[PDB]
Design an enzyme around this catalytic site. Structure first.
Site, PDB file in Angstrom:
ATOM      1  N   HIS A 143      40.684 111.189 -72.021  1.00  0.00           N
ATOM      2  CA  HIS A 143      41.461 112.396 -71.710  1.00  0.00           C
ATOM      3  C   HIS A 143      40.726 113.405 -70.821  1.00  0.00           C
ATOM      4  O   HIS A 143      41.334 114.380 -70.348  1.00  0.00           O
ATOM      5  CB  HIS A 143      41.965 113.081 -72.975  1.00  0.00           C
ATOM      6  CG  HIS A 143      40.887 113.612 -73.882  1.00  0.00           C
ATOM      7  ND1 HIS A 143      40.484 112.944 -75.015  1.00  0.00           N
ATOM      8  CD2 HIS A 143      40.172 114.762 -73.851  1.00  0.00           C
ATOM      9  CE1 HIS A 143      39.569 113.660 -75.646  1.00  0.00           C
ATOM     10  NE2 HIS A 143      39.364 114.770 -74.960  1.00  0.00           N
ATOM     11  N   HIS A 146      33.271 119.900 -69.893  1.00  0.00           N
ATOM     12  CA  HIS A 146      34.292 119.014 -69.328  1.00  0.00           C
ATOM     13  C   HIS A 146      35.208 119.846 -68.416  1.00  0.00           C
ATOM     14  O   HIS A 146      35.146 121.078 -68.398  1.00  0.00           O
ATOM     15  CB  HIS A 146      35.119 118.334 -70.402  1.00  0.00           C
ATOM     16  CG  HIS A 146      35.865 119.317 -71.247  1.00  0.00           C
ATOM     17  ND1 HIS A 146      35.314 119.866 -72.378  1.00  0.00           N
ATOM     18  CD2 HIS A 146      37.097 119.857 -71.116  1.00  0.00           C
ATOM     19  CE1 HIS A 146      36.179 120.736 -72.890  1.00  0.00           C
ATOM     20  NE2 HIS A 146      37.272 120.732 -72.142  1.00  0.00           N
ATOM     21  N   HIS A 164      39.429 120.149 -66.695  1.00  0.00           N
ATOM     22  CA  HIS A 164      40.858 119.860 -66.614  1.00  0.00           C
ATOM     23  C   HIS A 164      41.288 120.001 -65.148  1.00  0.00           C
ATOM     24  O   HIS A 164      40.806 120.901 -64.444  1.00  0.00           O
ATOM     25  CB  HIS A 164      41.650 120.823 -67.496  1.00  0.00           C
ATOM     26  CG  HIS A 164      41.179 120.879 -68.926  1.00  0.00           C
ATOM     27  ND1 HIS A 164      41.721 120.084 -69.909  1.00  0.00           N
ATOM     28  CD2 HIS A 164      40.161 121.576 -69.519  1.00  0.00           C
ATOM     29  CE1 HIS A 164      41.105 120.346 -71.064  1.00  0.00           C
ATOM     30  NE2 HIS A 164      40.147 121.225 -70.844  1.00  0.00           N
ATOM     31  N   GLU A 184      44.098 125.368 -67.052  1.00  0.00           N
ATOM     32  CA  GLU A 184      44.814 125.637 -68.322  1.00  0.00           C
ATOM     33  C   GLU A 184      45.191 127.109 -68.422  1.00  0.00           C
ATOM     34  O   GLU A 184      46.383 127.422 -68.618  1.00  0.00           O
ATOM     35  CB  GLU A 184      43.928 125.169 -69.466  1.00  0.00           C
ATOM     36  CG  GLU A 184      43.720 123.682 -69.419  1.00  0.00           C
ATOM     37  CD  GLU A 184      43.407 123.066 -70.739  1.00  0.00           C
ATOM     38  OE1 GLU A 184      42.519 123.606 -71.458  1.00  0.00           O
ATOM     39  OE2 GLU A 184      44.153 122.110 -71.102  1.00  0.00           O
ATOM     40  N   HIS A 188      35.171 123.851 -68.712  1.00  0.00           N
ATOM     41  CA  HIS A 188      34.969 124.429 -70.029  1.00  0.00           C
ATOM     42  C   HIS A 188      33.580 124.064 -70.542  1.00  0.00           C
ATOM     43  O   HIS A 188      33.327 122.894 -70.734  1.00  0.00           O
ATOM     44  CB  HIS A 188      36.004 123.851 -71.000  1.00  0.00           C
ATOM     45  CG  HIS A 188      37.364 124.391 -70.747  1.00  0.00           C
ATOM     46  ND1 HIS A 188      38.518 123.826 -71.249  1.00  0.00           N
ATOM     47  CD2 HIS A 188      37.736 125.488 -70.057  1.00  0.00           C
ATOM     48  CE1 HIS A 188      39.541 124.554 -70.852  1.00  0.00           C
ATOM     49  NE2 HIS A 188      39.098 125.588 -70.164  1.00  0.00           N
ATOM     50  N   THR A 192      42.129 123.424 -76.733  1.00  0.00           N
ATOM     51  CA  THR A 192      43.329 123.121 -75.905  1.00  0.00           C
ATOM     52  C   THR A 192      43.740 121.646 -75.974  1.00  0.00           C
ATOM     53  O   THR A 192      44.743 121.222 -75.334  1.00  0.00           O
ATOM     54  CB  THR A 192      43.178 123.559 -74.458  1.00  0.00           C
ATOM     55  OG1 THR A 192      42.236 122.664 -73.799  1.00  0.00           O
ATOM     56  CG2 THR A 192      42.817 125.103 -74.388  1.00  0.00           C
ATOM     57  N   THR A 193      42.979 120.848 -76.717  1.00  0.00           N
ATOM     58  CA  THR A 193      43.393 119.477 -77.052  1.00  0.00           C
ATOM     59  C   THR A 193      43.454 119.301 -78.577  1.00  0.00           C
ATOM     60  O   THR A 193      42.716 119.993 -79.319  1.00  0.00           O
ATOM     61  CB  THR A 193      42.424 118.420 -76.438  1.00  0.00           C
ATOM     62  OG1 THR A 193      41.083 118.701 -76.866  1.00  0.00           O
ATOM     63  CG2 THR A 193      42.455 118.475 -74.948  1.00  0.00           C
TER      64      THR A 193
HETATM   65 ZN   LIG Z   1      38.867 121.990 -72.121  1.00  0.00          ZN
END
Ligand SMILES: [Zn+2]
Length: 258
Positions: free
Chosen positions: A62, A92, A94, A104, A117, A196-197
């Site tokens: 992901h 990581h 996004h 995000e 992040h 957020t996951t």
């Molecule tokens: Zn994140």
């Protein structure tokens, strides 16, 4: 759990397995720059990464995580809205399929091309797994990316991605300096939110920098060559791995800058 960002398991579905998805402190949020108030209470923010020790990069299906040695206080975040010391465990990103989406958090409804992040845990709780069970357990430093000039400090990440194309692949990744991913200014907004996951735990103090970093189109095109799938499976490009903005509910966003 088989959550993802695809047509049938994406963010709109997460609430079925993770009902906290519809809770009172979910992330990300839109940052409305005209309603966020300067807070004189905020202590200076201290990003202390001199001794950071990266170990490994992993495609987790992901995103990819750059993992750090967090067995002692080597890379820490303190000050600002935080009480005590928060240890860096991973970073990581996004990102989107095209440059008009991928972040995000949004700023006056503006989406950036990506969002980095840096995830840190409160040392008072002893380990990450205990920290995520507490409202003040994590501090996440979020940094917006826009497409423009290349980020020299990112290129070591870009060049390893070909080696971790599919879910479950990892590569050694030592001696990476996360200070090379910071913008010039550390002005920020802060608010209480969540991961957020999945499992979407409500344990995060968000510190979102106002200044984006610039990355090149060639750099972000290499992120978009990663795969969500495992080796030998039908190829699904790793793109649009972002959760959309969630209701602010009672919360206030505070600004570090006047
Ligand atoms: Zn994140």
């Amino acid at each position: 759990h088989h959550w993802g960002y695809g047509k049938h398991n994406g963010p709109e579905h997460w609430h079925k397995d993770f009902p906290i998805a519809k809770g009172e402190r979910q992330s990300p949020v839109d940052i409305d720059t005209h309603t966020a108030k300067y807070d004189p209470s905020l202590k200076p923010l201290s990003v202390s990464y001199d001794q950071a020790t990266s170990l490994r990069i992993l495609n987790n299906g992901h995103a990819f995580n750059v993992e750090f040695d967090d067995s002692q206080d080597k890379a820490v975040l303190k000050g600002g809205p935080l009480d005590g010391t928060y240890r860096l465990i991973q970073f990581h990103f996004h990102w989107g399929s095209l440059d008009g989406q991928g972040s995000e958090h949004t700023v006056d409804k503006k989406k950036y091309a990506a969002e980095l992040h840096l995830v840190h845990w409160n040392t008072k709780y002893g380990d990450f797994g205990k920290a995520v069970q507490q409202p003040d357990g994590l501090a996440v430093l979020g940094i917006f990316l826009k497409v423009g000039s290349a980020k020299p400090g990112l290129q070591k990440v870009v060049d390893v991605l070909d080696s971790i194309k599919t879910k479950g692949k990892s590569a050694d990744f030592t001696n990476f300096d996360p200070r090379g991913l910071l913008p010039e200014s550390l002005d920020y907004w802060t608010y209480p939110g969540s991961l957020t996951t999945p499992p979407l735990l409500e344990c995060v103090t968000w510190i979102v920098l106002k200044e984006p970093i610039s990355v090149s189109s060639e750099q972000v095109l290499k992120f978009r060559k990663l795969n969500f799938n495992g080796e030998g499976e039908p190829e699904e490009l790793m793109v649009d791995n972002w959760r959309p903005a969630q209701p602010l509910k009672n919360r206030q966003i505070k600004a570090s800058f006047k």
